[PDB]
């Protein structure tokens, strides 16, 4: 679909009926719903939704009206309006501003005592806006609000084994959007009890009577089960008033009751909308279950007596072991337990909904203050502006984007990292779950995840299973349930109609696999088909027993997983490792698209938003390293600013380079500038290297990697890293901090680079301890200059200075602020971690000279050597498949079709019959190059410059030993593999300490590389030292090196003075204990024996 994409021949044999949707639509559509954008309104009104209502409109309608006790005063809100954004994205990121737009709402005040109306526009604050990239710019930084998985409101039934009697017991809980919980259960003694708002358990009949039920009505509705009759006959309460009084006592202990509040307490607690509601999603769920309020649309959001009675009846029927239940007048429904892990129950709070909830809290605070201050002002002159307090709402919005877990720094390590961050599904966070809740259980892969959450992607750290990634084809319901598309199938012929099914909908049908052999019109050729059944059970069924089919084999995978070639040949563990490692590859100075890859790099790169795409068709007018000018055919002129050597949140380079020249004609949507990790508009996370699979002198033992010096000489794996150093000058109790070129008691040479302001000049080389900006402070002055930390160096590439004298919005107390950016080129070196896309990872153990590497018969040295022993035992043989195909891509192929096409090539599309050298190919994850096709292509490779083929049909070549010169006795597998430079460089993992700062809380050495701390000497290390019998070393570690200050300094002086280290003894912490013992009149004495 991309007008100007590079050609990449594909091995796919299936035809896609549906193209991948906007990958980051989950963010943009949600936010457009929040602000009620015109696009969202048009999209929603076309779906069938009548009179769409936005998030802001929803919360404002919920808020209004605001009225007093007498109902004389009223205040209403309407028409939320957004003005133009205050500053551009670039300016927002330059001046540490927030990308926000003013918000205006019309507030109308009504005074029934006179009937006069007063409408007025009220400024509600600067609402932060979402960029087209799906990010929020707060205080100059880029942030992503991750979607949150939460158990949707509804009614949930479960059965658990009693830990006392081992008995199975049934329970149900009603989970509302807001308000008191309501739980029912059957205990180990077959007594039905109810817990209202998590209080003490009491018989359910008490609540039934509290709702106005009489004994006759209870015995009529119930009585099908003897346990309910037993509970009723064994209840010491009779009458609605009696039950209401008992509930009052068990909810509000001690305080006097009254008939006035007896009914009111329950009515407010569960039935009045201003205190309890099911949020229009709990209402829908509770209607679908229990068969209540069927047919007619959702009209009210609150609970009803019918819901409570139906829940009780359902619980009792489930306990009795029944499977079908029918409420009087309702639709018959199944009786079953509810799986809380099923995406039919778990829903997704999108960014818009989280922001809406925070706005709701702020509006509640505003409602409280308005309710307070209407009484304290003259009703004959009050206006909407005097009543309104906008400090709480703006405070709530400002706090959500600050100290909140869901709003997180954007993962700007590379474009794919940010793209996967936006499509992240986080189960934790406010309201998600806590440390005390499910561990092993909630982290499992559930059958309902298919096509909705990727089963492979998950962060390596403590959040395995708790954080997932949205599938490529999935989308969110208005209720927040994740749908996925399927093709209709009728009479055994696959139909072209596509339906977005939710997990609950999907469980009711039979779905066939994407790779179903079908005729031209879609009729299944096989009499039997592989399908997924209701309970996630895979089965083989008749071709006429299928209702739906997967749109594509990529249905179940996400972007990074979809970017792994030959994924089906790799075990799930290594696939997960490769998917996660793709997310942390550092951009290189030169980008290079994979020689062998998937058909996903281009779309992922374009959707990530780090490539500049022409807004509309036009002719390139002027191209520079900084900006691109396009003269559109419509007459308008566009100018795109390019980011050059900009620092990412993680410290990587975000340089953008144009890929067009003046006078070129560009179609709308065409890529005109590449991002950090793209070549011509597609992912270029790594480099294609010539690899030989063999053990080599033990330098690649235990997953170590051997690199050719070419990768250092030609800057193949070189990267640019930018670090930021910040320093502020403030007020004090003794004066203020001053910045100047003058620093006391320092040499003239250490401040040579400093300019008139005392700031290091741009382009200056700075290393460990060099002064960046000189700052002098009151204790006759004291030096407090900023300096380069230990082991850091680079070139000064930028300075940003903010001052209070220039009306810069620095925080209170700060008078000035300076940021200095230092850039460094890092070559590839021993200890840096390299990895492929198949989970094969290792640190560089040796970088051999060019003439030491094994070299091909034509003299070409291999770039990397990988050990043979790593592959077979890890079931990541896909890395081998790639290695072969990567060769066939580097050297073109030509299938001989003289006497007809060969049998192995009968499936290859004709476009794959031949290709030139340095060609790029695409092999989708579950539909691509087959083993036989690849085997034939290996034998169909073109000759080299000299007219001979080096890699034979087996994929192996004879390699000469660069050191001894003799040919290796056996042929070795040689190919081209795409490898990544991961962000785990040894340059920022080496840490050492002889002496340094100490924690004043315990006097022990600090902990951390940035704190110049020491290594942990754990208790198990103490055990290991004890087993050696090394008493002296253990004592030295425990006493001198950690705790003893006097011994510490004594040993330091002894070492620097060249005398044998003294004997530790009589520890201070032992002297304190001895003196405490003496304080208790205990004559503690040390005996010489």
């Amino acid at each position: 679909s991309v007008p100007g994409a590079p050609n990449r021949v594909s091995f796919a044999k299936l035809r896609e009926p549906l193209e991948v949707p906007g990958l980051l639509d989950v963010q943009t559509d949600s936010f457009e719903w929040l602000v009620g954008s015109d696009r969202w309104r048009q999209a929603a009104i076309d779906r069938g939704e009548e009179n769409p209502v936005g998030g802001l409109e929803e919360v404002l309608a919920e808020l209004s009206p605001i009225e007093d006790f007498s109902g004389s005063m009223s205040l209403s809100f309407s028409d939320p309006r957004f003005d133009e954004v205050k500053a551009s994205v670039d300016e927002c990121k330059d001046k540490d501003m927030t990308y926000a737009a003013p918000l205006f709402v019309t507030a109308e005040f009504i005074n029934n005592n006179t009937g006069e109306i007063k409408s007025q526009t009220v400024f509600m604050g600067d609402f932060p806006m979402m960029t087209e990239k799906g990010t929020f710019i707060i205080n100059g930084t880029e942030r992503v609000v991750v979607s949150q998985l939460v158990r949707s409101p509804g009614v949930y039934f479960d059965e658990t084994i009693d830990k006392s009697t081992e008995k199975t017991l049934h329970s149900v809980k009603v989970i509302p959007g807001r308000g008191a919980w309501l739980e029912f259960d059957v205990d180990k003694r077959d007594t039905v009890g109810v817990r209202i708002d998590r209080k003490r358990r009491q018989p359910v009949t008490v609540l039934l009577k509290a709702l106005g039920w009489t004994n006759e009505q209870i015995v009529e509705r119930f009585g099908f089960s003897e346990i309910m009759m037993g509970t009723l006959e064994k209840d010491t309460t009779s009458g609605t008033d009696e039950a209401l009084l008992d509930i009052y006592r068990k909810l509000r202990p001690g305080e006097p009751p009254t008939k006035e509040s007896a009914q009111t307490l329950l009515e407010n607690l569960f039935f009045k909308e201003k205190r309890y509601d099911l949020a229009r999603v709990g209402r829908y769920k509770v209607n679908k279950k229990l068969g209540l309020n069927a047919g007619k649309p959702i009209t009210s959001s609150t609970l009803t007596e019918e819901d409570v009675v139906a829940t009780i009846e359902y619980l009792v029927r489930l306990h009795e072991g029944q499977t079908s239940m029918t409420v009087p007048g309702g639709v018959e429904v199944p009786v079953e337990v509810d799986d809380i892990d099923h995406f039919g129950n778990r829903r997704l709070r999108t960014v818009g909904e989280l922001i809406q909830n925070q706005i709701r809290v702020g509006l509640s605070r505003m409602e409280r203050v308005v309710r307070e201050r209407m009484t304290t002002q003259d009703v004959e002159a009050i206006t909407p502006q005097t009543l309104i307090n906008i400090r709480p709402v703006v405070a709530a919005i400002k706090e959500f984007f600050g100290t909140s877990q869901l709003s997180q720094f954007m993962d700007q390590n590379n474009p794919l990292s940010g793209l996967t961050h936006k499509r992240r599904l986080s189960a934790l966070g406010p309201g998600g779950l806590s440390r005390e809740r499910a561990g092993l259980e909630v982290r499992d892969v559930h059958p309902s995840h298919y096509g909705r959450m990727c089963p492979i992607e998950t962060p390596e750290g403590p959040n395995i299973g708790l954080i997932g990634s949205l599938s490529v084809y999935a989308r969110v319901n208005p209720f927040g349930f994740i749908e996925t598309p399927y093709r209709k199938v009728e009479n055994g012929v696959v139909t072209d109609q596509i339906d977005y099914l939710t997990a609950d909908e999907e469980d009711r049908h039979v779905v066939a696999q994407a790779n179903s052999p079908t005729d031209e019109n879609g009729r299944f050729t096989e009499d039997r088909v592989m399908v997924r059944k209701k309970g996630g059970e895979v089965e083989f069924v008749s071709a006429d027993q299928v209702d739906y089919m997967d749109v594509s084999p990529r249905q179940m995978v996400s972007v990074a997983t979809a970017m792994i070639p030959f994924l089906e040949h790799d075990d799930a563990n290594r696939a997960l490792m490769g998917a996660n490692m793709q997310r942390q590859a550092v951009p290189l100075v030169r980008s290079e698209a994979p020689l062998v890859g998937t058909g996903m790099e281009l779309r992922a790169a374009i959707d990530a938003g780090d490539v500049v795409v022409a807004d509309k068709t036009g002719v390139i007018e002027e191209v520079s390293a900084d900006y691109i000018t396009v003269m559109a055919d419509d007459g308008t002129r566009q100018s795109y600013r390019l980011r050059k050597f900009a620092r990412s949140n993680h410290g990587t380079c975000a340089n953008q380079r144009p890929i067009v020249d003046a006078g070129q004609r560009v179609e709308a949507g065409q890529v005109i500038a590449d991002g950090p990790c793209t070549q011509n508009g597609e992912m270029a996370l790594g480099k294609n290297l010539l690899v030989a699979i063999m053990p080599w002198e033990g330098h690649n033992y235990e997953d170590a990697i051997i690199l050719s010096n070419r990768l250092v000489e030609e800057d193949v794996l070189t990267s640019i890293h930018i670090e930021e150093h910040e320093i502020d000058a403030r007020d004090t109790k003794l004066g203020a901090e001053e910045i100047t070129r003058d620093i006391p008691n320092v040499s003239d040479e250490v401040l040579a680079d400093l300019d008139e302001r005392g700031i290091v000049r741009i382009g200056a080389e700075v290393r460990d301890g060099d002064i960046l900006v000189g700052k002098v402070t009151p204790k006759e002055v004291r030096d407090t200059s900023l300096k380069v930390p230990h082991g850091e160096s680079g070139k000064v590439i930028g300075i940003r200075v903010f001052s209070r004298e220039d009306d810069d919005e620095l925080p209170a107390g700060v008078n000035e602020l300076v940021r200095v950016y230092v850039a460094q080129k890092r070559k590839i070196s021993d200890g840096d971690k390299l990895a492929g896309r198949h989970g094969n990872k290792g640190v560089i153990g040796k970088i051999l000279p060019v003439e030491d590497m094994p070299f091909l018969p034509d003299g070409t040295p291999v770039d990397i050597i990988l050990n043979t022993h790593g592959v077979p035992r890890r079931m990541n043989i896909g890395q081998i498949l790639e290695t072969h195909l990567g060769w066939v891509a580097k050297a073109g192929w030509n299938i001989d079709v003289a006497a007809g096409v060969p049998d192995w090539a009968s499936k290859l599309p004709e476009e794959l019959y031949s290709a030139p050298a340095d060609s790029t190919v695409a092999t989708p994850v579950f539909d691509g190059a087959q083993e036989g096709e690849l085997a034939g292509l290996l034998g169909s490779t073109l000759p080299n410059r000299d007219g001979e083929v080096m890699v034979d049909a087996d994929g192996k070549s004879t390699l000469f030993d660069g050191r001894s010169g003799e040919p290796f006795p056996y042929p070795v597998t040689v190919g081209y593999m795409y490898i990544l430079k991961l962000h785990h460089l040894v340059d920022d993992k080496i840490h050492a300490r002889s002496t340094g700062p100490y924690s004043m809380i315990t006097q022990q050495p600090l902990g951390g590389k940035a704190q110049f701390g020491g290594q942990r000497f754990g208790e198990m290390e103490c055990w290991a030292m004890q087993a050696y019998g090394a008493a002296y070393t253990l004592q030295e570690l425990l006493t001198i090196k950690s705790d003893d200050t006097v011994g510490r300094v004594k040993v330091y002086e002894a070492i620097v003075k060249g005398e044998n280290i003294p004997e530790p003894g009589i520890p201070e912490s032992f002297k304190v204990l001895l003196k405490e013992l003496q304080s208790l009149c205990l004559n503690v004495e040390v005996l010489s024996s």
């Binding site: 081992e166 008995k167 199975t168 003897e226 009795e320 072991g321």
Partner: protein
């Protein structure tokens, strides 16, 4: 070669009766003390003839239409889907024990899933009913069933002495409940 008693085709062995034979003509029970069959006893699901050998002699006694009405009544008692308090009464020589055993077997089989955890209590002067349950439902009789005499209701305690025929009567009536309260009030 052998069917698990929970298998669907083994359902008749528990539910079939002479009035509603689920396509079976004879049901044979083996009494086993280990890896050995001590003896077997057969019941015809239909009109008997007397040549069959059963320790209960039901086939011979019934071989010695009124027999059709006997079968109908026994089936009515056995198959009753009451899931409640069923009181079976019969004069001596009518075979209330056999019908009760078949009824309890049917009830326990049809509701095994609903009562696999709660357990079954047996009360009477002899464990014969528990013997039958164990010989037809060992998975339930061995580990789930419980037996108690009226003097063994209290755990730990095991009484066998019986009181005089007047103190027992007052002590055996709810009229004494008011006394007990008074006692703790005393």
């Amino acid at each position: 070669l052998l069917l698990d008693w929970r298998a669907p085709m083994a359902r008749p062995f528990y539910v079939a009766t002479a009035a509603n034979p689920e396509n079976m003509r004879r049901r044979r029970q083996f009494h086993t003390l280990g890896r050995k069959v001590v003896d077997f006893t057969d019941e015809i699901l239909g009109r008997p003839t007397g040549a069959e050998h059963d320790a209960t002699n039901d086939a011979a006694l019934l071989a010695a239409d009124i027999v059709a009405t006997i079968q109908a009544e026994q089936d009515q008692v056995i198959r009753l889907d009451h899931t409640g308090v069923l009181v079976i009464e019969g004069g001596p020589g009518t075979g209330k024990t056999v019908v009760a055993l078949h009824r309890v077997a049917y009830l326990l089989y049809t509701y095994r899933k609903q009562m696999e955890r709660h357990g079954v209590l047996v009360v009477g002067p002899t464990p014969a009913f528990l013997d039958h349950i164990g010989r037809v439902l060992p998975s339930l009789g061995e580990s789930d069933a419980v037996f108690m005499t009226p003097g063994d209701f209290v755990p730990g305690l095991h009484v066998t002495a019986e009181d005089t025929p007047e103190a027992a009567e007052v002590k055996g009536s709810l009229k004494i409940l008011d006394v007990l309260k008074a006692a703790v009030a005393d």
